[PDB]
């Protein structure tokens, strides 16, 4: 496979080239804003982002080597994590605000329009401020996002030869993260420390996704926020 034959810079090149675009929302600033309209905007945006995420996953090295059943499984458990880390990355340069779209910037005050959303908003803000303090690089972000895709579902799977292949790709991404930090002048002690700090953030992203997934499972029962057929299939994959 070409995934195990890629160098570090070639890995970064492939990941940077496969980046999905930043989509716009249908946000009308003049129009009044109900709790159901804000969620309608967030649902519409996330549904369109999902289509791009699926084609982005195809371009992640090693992902196409997997069986079709495993690709479905990895995306079903990781899709919200990937949306959330993308949101957090876009919001680094906007302290106290979440850039859902270039025309949709929300602070924690607007997040209060949806009940229970406040806690998830604050965790996303805290993750965004952590990236800002660490000065996370774009080359490091695409590595982390691809780690989430390959790691988040590998322990939720007779012939586990495909599981061993995912770990070989994960190790190559680790080599790529280290190659980036050594390129930026960090010492060996600094490289290992930064690598650990980044991967520990993925634990909190999993936490946010789990808490977010159960907030989405309740709004489906309320039937007030519209839910697309793809998102309902993604949401039912966790229940």
């Amino acid at each position: 496979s070409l995934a195990l034959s890629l160098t570090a810079d070639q890995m970064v090149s492939a990941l940077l080239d496969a980046e999905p675009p930043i989509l716009y929302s249908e946000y009308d600033p003049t129009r009044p804003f109900s709790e159901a309209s804000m969620m309608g905007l967030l649902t519409n945006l996330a549904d369109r982002e999902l289509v791009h995420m699926i084609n982005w996953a195809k371009r992640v090295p090693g992902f196409v080597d997997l069986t079709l059943h495993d690709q479905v499984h990895l995306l079903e458990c990781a899709w919200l994590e990937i949306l959330m880390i993308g949101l957090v990355w876009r919001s680094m340069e906007h302290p106290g605000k979440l850039l859902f779209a270039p025309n949709l910037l929300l602070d924690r005050n607007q997040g209060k329009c949806v009940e229970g959303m406040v806690e998830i908003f604050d965790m996303l803000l805290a993750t965004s401020s952590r990236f800002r303090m660490m000065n996370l690089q774009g080359e490091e972000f695409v590595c982390l996002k691809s780690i989430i895709l390959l790691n988040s579902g590998v322990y939720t799977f007779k012939s586990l030869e495909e599981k061993d292949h995912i770990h070989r790709v994960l190790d190559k991404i680790t080599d790529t993260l280290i190659h980036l930090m050594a390129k930026a002048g960090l010492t060996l002690q600094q490289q290992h420390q930064r690598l650990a700090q980044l991967l520990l953030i993925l634990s909190h992203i999993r936490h946010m996704s789990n808490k977010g997934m159960e907030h989405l499972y309740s709004m489906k029962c309320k039937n007030v926020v519209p839910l697309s057929d793809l998102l309902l299939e993604m949401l039912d994959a966790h229940r």
């Binding site: 289509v51 996953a57 079709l68 690709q71 079903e76 057929d229 993604m234």
Partner: peptide, 9 residues
């Protein structure tokens, strides 16, 4: 699954 079809095409 919609996800399955989109991963094929």
């Amino acid at each position: 699954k919609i996800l399955h079809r989109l991963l094929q095409d």
